Amino acid sequence: PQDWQRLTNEYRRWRPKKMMVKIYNLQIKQVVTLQGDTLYNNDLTAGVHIFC
Amino acid sequence: ENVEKEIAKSAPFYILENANHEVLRTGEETNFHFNFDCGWVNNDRAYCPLQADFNPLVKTRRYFATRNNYNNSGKFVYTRYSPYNKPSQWMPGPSLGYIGNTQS
Amino acid sequence: CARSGFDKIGLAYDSAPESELEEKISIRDIDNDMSRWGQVFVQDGTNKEISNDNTGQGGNTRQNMAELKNVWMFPNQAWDSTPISRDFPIWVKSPNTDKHTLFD
Amino acid sequence: GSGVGVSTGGWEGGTLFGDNRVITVNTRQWYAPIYNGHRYTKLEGTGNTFWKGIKTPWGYFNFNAYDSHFSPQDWQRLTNEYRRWRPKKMMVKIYNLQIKQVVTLQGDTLYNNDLTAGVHIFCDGSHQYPYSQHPWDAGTMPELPYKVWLLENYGYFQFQGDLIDTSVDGGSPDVENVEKEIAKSAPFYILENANHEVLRTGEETNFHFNFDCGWVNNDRAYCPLQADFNPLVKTRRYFATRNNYNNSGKFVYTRYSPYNKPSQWMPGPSLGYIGNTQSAATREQALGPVTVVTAPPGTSAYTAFTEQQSKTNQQSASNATWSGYDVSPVNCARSGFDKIGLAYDSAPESELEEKISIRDIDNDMSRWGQVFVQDGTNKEISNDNTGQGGNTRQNMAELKNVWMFPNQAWDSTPISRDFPIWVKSPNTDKHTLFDSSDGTLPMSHPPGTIFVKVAKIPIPTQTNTDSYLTLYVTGQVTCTIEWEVERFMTKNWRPESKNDVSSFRDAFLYTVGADGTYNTPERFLEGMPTRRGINKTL
Amino acid sequence: AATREQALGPVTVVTAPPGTSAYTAFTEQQSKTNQQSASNATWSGYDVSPVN
Amino acid sequence: DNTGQGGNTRQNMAELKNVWMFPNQAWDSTPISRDFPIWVKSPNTDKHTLFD
Amino acid sequence: FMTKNWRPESKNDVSSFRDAFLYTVGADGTYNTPERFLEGMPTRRGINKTL
Amino acid sequence: FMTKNWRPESKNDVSSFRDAFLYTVGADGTYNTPERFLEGMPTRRGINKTL
Amino acid sequence: PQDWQRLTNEYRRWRPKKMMVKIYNLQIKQVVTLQGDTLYNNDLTAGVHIFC
Amino acid sequence: GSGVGVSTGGWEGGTLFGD
């Protein structure tokens, strides 16, 4: 909210130049129900598909 | 010859597994760069109507026509605009006066 | 488009995602920019229909002025795009069609 | 070398016609009085108008007209010999400055020259100050090089009287009152914030400018957009015809005539509104084809009510003239209405006679007289099969209002010798196609306005009230514009119509009379308009 | 209509310069300009098709 | 008046037969058959709108 | 922006907001957002543009 | 200034002025000046300073 | 007023660094009363004392 | 150059905001 306020108050116009996105610290968790309870344990060697 | 039969035939179906893309694990990361090509976003306002910007201190050179007798024998009689009312060449921007349906 | 009189009509939106507590619907009321117009009126001639004879007095009454509700694109039009709030979309996908008119 | 007793320059003038360039040098004798008593004051229009603005202790050089730059013959030779022209670069030179003091020693007034008095000269090239100069203003450079030119007082719009009206009382701040806000956010400009020169009699100054602009086309189309084709070949296209006037009907097709062929080229835009002629006695209400009421959403302009459909403040068409500003002419590509929009006088400050000239003559066939649209059969269809016709139906209608549409091509209005050259294009984000029905060339950054005021020399007073010394500035200004031109070439066999004087109705014109009154055209043809004889293959 | 050379088309355009009188023309008394009836205009004018 | 019930009936919706050029319009040109003309002469006029 | 305007421009101050507690969390953690368009700090407020 | 503050600061907008016509000349040329301290745009308004 | 507003809104603190004053375009006028009227005529070779 | 009839300076004004 302040970056917006300071943007609109101090500047005549703006446009984006270039964007950079970074997807990192990935963590893949498995959901298993051992009993009535649900427990969340981390399964290594599971992949995630990412497509731009 | 059935055209609706054809629309359904020529409708696409897309699958994202045709495309080359990354498969990552916990240790891996990825990033993407993009370069915008775009117009601006203007933060400043006009304080004046498009047609109101002129100098009342000078008298205009232009006259406006007036019909006189309301019949076939009539003709336009011309008289000078007021300094405070001057014609303009700048039209209003486009608009559609339809407010949308509120029928409940 | 360029009519600011109707700013209140088109856009109404909520900031709060996934909040069933309250609507909090915000509508764009405030535009002080004078390059956007409230109304446009067109006036096509005298206020009384012309008599077909020479001499004679006026004729049946006639509608001199009218509001133009629908203003399309025309030469020498200049206006300003709507003021945007903090929560708006930045960009929109332009279609991949062959022909495009002015982007506003 | 330099000083009080050597001139800074000399009188330059004339014209140079060339193949690719025309250079018109013009010098005038000008003077600036003390405007408004050296004070900024709120300018309010008398009568009924809501225009409100500032009156400024400044005056300015307005170089925008053709007749100021070209003589009557330079114009004639321009329009006859050249296909198109545009300005390239302008250079103005303000020199031979002389500051005189006005003192009344007795009943008589005597004019004695006070050295060491300055003059402020400011060219706004960035347009940081309101550009209030309008085309079709009477304060441009005189067409007669021997007439002295009184600079015009500068002033600018500030706020709209009926958009500051409601509940603007200053008892307590109303942040939700929008009209209270318009008045708060209205600007106020002072030309003493800007860096500018102060000159004395020995000093001079000059300014250069580089135009970036479109052209001014002097050639006419002899053919309608849709009439250019070869009747010797038969067309391949057929036109549909309904047969039986009922549901069982269908279109039956038959070939166009060789002499009637369809076209892909639409008529250029036009608005069929001729403006209000009601015999209204108020000159300051809006009489114009399109009057535009600018009001922000929350504001109430003059007498306004809420339309209950949209629940927004709106005005009656009669009240809107109070609150709004007309645009004329709107006819654009329709040449049928040429007579409607423009009427103007050449003669400045002459109370002798009106001499109002209206643009009657346009021979250009790329501009259309009327457009008719015809939507189907002349009789309504019966809902049963078989049956005969139905209730009568209106087959054809005139389209009065033609907006912008794909495949439109037209030509701008022919301009006379005395028109404005350019017009300020607004600094708005969005613009459509530039076509001015007054023929002007809109430019993003036109030549920067040159402002002049006379330095304020105080008079000591016991009462300490403001008292200034009464004195004025006279000088010489040389405006030299370089024009980019194109000579025409044609394979046409027949002779073209050249703007001869033989077509003038008045024999003695562009010449002084017995008392020195310079006789000017009262007609549009006598002003030697463009687009006369030079033919343009469509 | 049996006449192939009259204008049958969505938009028929009568090009006449201001002072001219095209075919059978009358003066509209509002603008005092020569105008034509929609039936006569087909004689004097040129259709554009298709306008869709 | 305030309160009250409705009023005279009103036409809510209508077909727009004539759609002129307006901002944010995007469309595609007509499909052409094997036998069409390739090109057309653009007029030598000063002003042109969009070519479709 | 750069301007020769003398008078002060309208800057999107919070003082014009109707709700005092806004853009801040509450007792239960609910982040209070604007329900009005002015409280969303729109553009085109005070910066004047010579026409 | 630089800040990590999330919320918008109070900026000395003119909207808080009580008198609409201010810092501008009148009909007779009288330049209208603030009669109040807020209308004189004081310092130390919105910019927050971590203690 | 706007330079002040933009100053106070956009900046955390300020102080002056260096000032430069320039006194120029000097004009010395004499006040003489030739009659009931007072007339103001410019007398060259009259000095002004300036001391910083 | 210099003398009774040439000005010693000109009107300067405005402001420049910078970082």
Author numbering:
A (entry chain I), I (entry chain B): 105 to 156
B (entry chain I): 209 to 312
C (entry chain I): 365 to 468
D (entry chain A): 34 to 571
E (entry chain G): 313 to 364
F (entry chain G): 417 to 468
G (entry chain I), H (entry chain B): 521 to 571
J (entry chain B): 34 to 52
Copy text verbatim from the article accompanying this structure deposition.
To expand the structural repertoire of determined capsid structures for the diverse Bocaparvovirus genus, viruses infecting dogs (CnMV), pigs (PBoV1), and rats (RBoV) were selected. The ORFs of these viruses coding for the major capsid protein VP2 were cloned into the pFastBac1 plasmid to enable the production of the virus-like particles (VLPs), using the Bac-to-Bac expression system in insect Sf9 cells. In the icosahedral capsid, the 60 VPs assemble via two-, three-, and fivefold symmetry-related VP interactions, resulting in pores at the fivefold symmetry axes, protrusions surrounding the threefold axes, and depressions at the twofold axes.
Canine Minute Virus (CnMV) was first isolated from German military dogs in 1967 and was initially thought to be non-pathogenic. Later, it was found to be pathogenic in newborn puppies and fetuses, as the virus was found in the lungs and intestines of nursing puppies, leading to lesions, diarrhea, and death. Following cryo-EM data collection, three-dimensional-image reconstruction of the capsids, utilizing 50,866 (CnMV), 98,388 (PBoV1), and 9199 (RBoV) individual capsid images, resulted in a resolution of 2.72, 2.31, and 2.52 Å, respectively. The high resolution of the cryo-EM maps allowed the building of reliable atomic models, starting from amino acids 34, 41, and 42 (VP2 numbering) at the N-terminus for CnMV, PBoV1, and RBoV, respectively. In contrast, the CnMV capsid shows very prominent threefold protrusions, while PBoV1 and RBoV follow the previously described characteristics of the genus. The more prominent threefold protrusions of CnMV are the result of significant insertions into VR-IV (+1 aa vs. BPV, +2 aa vs. PBoV1 and HBoV1, +4 aa vs. RBoV) and VR-VIII (+12 aa vs. PBoV1, +13 aa vs. RBoV, +15 aa vs. BPV, +17 aa vs. HBoV1). The lack of any twofold depression in CnMV is caused by an insertion in VR-III (+2 aa vs. HBoV1, +3 aa vs. PBoV1, + 6 aa vs. RBoV and BPV) and its loop conformation advancing towards the twofold symmetry axis. In contrast to VR-III, CnMV’s VR-I is the shortest loop in comparison to the other bocaviruses (−3 aa vs. BPV, −4 aa vs. HBoV1, −6 aa vs. PBoV1 and RBoV) and is located between the threefold protrusion and the fivefold region. Another feature previously observed for the bocaviruses, with the exception of GBoV1, was the presence of density extending into the interior of the capsid below the fivefold channel.
